[PDB]
Ligand binder design. Structure first.
Ligand SMILES: CC(C)=CCC/C(C)=C/CC/C(C)=C/CO
Ligand SMILES: CC(C)=CCC/C(C)=C/CC/C(C)=C\CO
Ligand SMILES: CC(C)=CCC/C(C)=C/CO
Length: 195
């Protein structure tokens, strides 16, 4: 027994395994359904342009991030890890989140162009905003903050800038991307005295 919303969630999760081979397409969705033992006809629950699969992927990545940040916070509470200052915390959080893209990196510029279509932009912006909100919550944010916008605008700019750099990066294990991110974070957290 399971609801329709749950059923569609499970199919789209399974479809992700096939995006590397087939792109953000109905074909990936149909392979996902079949990999679960359902009919390929279950792809007909979804559109053809890939928007639902991509938005599903972004949401899932944001959920995985919060679970990672929760786990890391628990290590801190048990005395197994140091509490990181904000610059290192943010660098690690953005890296954790962007690494989730590595298996899909050849397809990620295409996904970004689809997330920017007019009918997707409100949802893509909500998801970005929720992501940076979450990151700041675990970085130690207070419920009430006069710097609410500045913090989120800055962190969104670091994230998106680094994402663009990563789509050009051929260095081993994206070395050059994480060095860029480190510099962007260090400069944003100490903007008054940057080079
Ligand atoms: C603020 C503008 C103009 C674009 C950002 C919206 C966008 C392209 C989001 C892509 C997906 C993303 C970065 C998700 C993070 O949760
Ligand atoms: C690759 C495509 C089609 C779009 C790039 C995604 C965006 C919106 C990048 C701009 C984000 C940025 C560099 C800073 C925050 O606005
Ligand atoms: C774009 C901003 C600042 C917030 C997301 C818009 C919104 C309230 C969506 C409801 O799901």
């Amino acid at each position: 027994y399971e609801s329709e919303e749950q059923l569609q969630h499970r199919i789209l999760t399974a479809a992700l395994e096939f995006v590397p081979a087939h792109g953000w397409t109905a074909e990936a969705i149909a392979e996902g359904a079949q990999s679960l033992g359902l009919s390929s006809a279950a792809a007909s629950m979804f559109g053809k342009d890939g928007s639902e699969l991509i938005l599903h992927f972004v949401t899932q990545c944001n959920t995985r991030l919060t679970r990672v940040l929760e786990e890391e916070q628990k290590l801190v509470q048990l005395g197994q890890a140091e509490k990181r200052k904000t610059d290192q915390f943010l660098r690690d959080a953005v890296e954790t989140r962007l690494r989730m893209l590595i298996p899909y990196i050849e397809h990620w510029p295409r996904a970004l162009s689809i997330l920017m279509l007019p009918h997707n932009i409100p949802s893509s912006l909500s998801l970005l905003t929720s992501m940076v909100d979450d990151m700041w919550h675990y970085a130690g944010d207070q419920s009430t903050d006069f710097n609410w916008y500045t913090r989120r605008a800055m962190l969104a700019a670091i994230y998106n800038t680094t994402e663009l750099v990563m789509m050009q990066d051929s260095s081993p294990d994206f070395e050059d991307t994480w060095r860029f991110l480190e510099n962007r974070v260090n400069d944003a957290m100490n903007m008054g005295h940057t080079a």
